[PDB]
């Protein structure tokens, strides 16, 4: 099926980890799995409903990292006066996405905050 302690949904294996890490450390940890893996991604509502079923018993209700980082980075930024966005001067700031261990609702967080997370790989 999936290695012990992991759970399969639709050809993929999932594991919750109740261990506050920042987004990079959490994605790191997933990459470090014996089968190399990533922070959970969601392709459907039903996959999200399955993942929260997993998070609930032990992780709920911590924030849990999902695999979306720098969510405000590559936006098509422009000037309202139409000037060319040539010169630039941004902070020094990154946001990442998370959900509560209990609902499917996403939450934008500073990437250096500390949440739980779920790893995912293809079986």
């Amino acid at each position: 099926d999936c290695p012990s302690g992991w759970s399969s949904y639709e050809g993929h294996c999932y594991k919750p980890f109740n261990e506050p890490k920042n987004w990079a450390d959490a994605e790191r940890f997933c990459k470090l799995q014996p089968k190399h893996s990533h922070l959970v991604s969601f392709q459907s509502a039903e996959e999200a409903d399955f993942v929260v079923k997993l998070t609930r018993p032990r992780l709920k209700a911590n924030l849990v990292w999902m695999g979306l980082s720098n969510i405000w980075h590559g936006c098509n930024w422009q000037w309202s006066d139409g000037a060319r966005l040539n010169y630039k001067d941004w902070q020094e700031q990154s946001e990442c996405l998370a959900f509560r261990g209990v609902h499917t609702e996403w939450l934008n967080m500073d990437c250096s905050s500390t949440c739980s997370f779920v790893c995912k790989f293809k079986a």
Binding site: H38, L39, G67, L68, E105
Partner: protein, 133 residues
Amino acid sequence: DCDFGWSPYDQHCYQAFNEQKTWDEAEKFCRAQENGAHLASIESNGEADFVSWLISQKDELADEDYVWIGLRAQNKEQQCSSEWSDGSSVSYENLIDLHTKKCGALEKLTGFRKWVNYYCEQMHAFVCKLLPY
């Protein structure tokens, strides 16, 4: 030819308004000023320094955290990360109950120079830039 209340810089006119507006209210306000201004664009170092000096000089201002300038994402998705960390692309999204940080502001604690993406529906003071007639 700048009006009273406006400060000249480099052929443009600038004014920091202490009214607290949403980013959309602020831009609309600016358009209704003189021969039609906009939220400030920052197109150089010199101008960043100027706008920054302008704010730090406006006394009503205040103690105020954020000051809108004319930066807006366009966008087009409701978050800008095109791919998940597994290489797949984002099709389902659950952004219900989540506000977007798709408008740009200057920030008090970073000397009103560095740009901060921030929530558009937040009301703040703002700077207009105008090309006089």
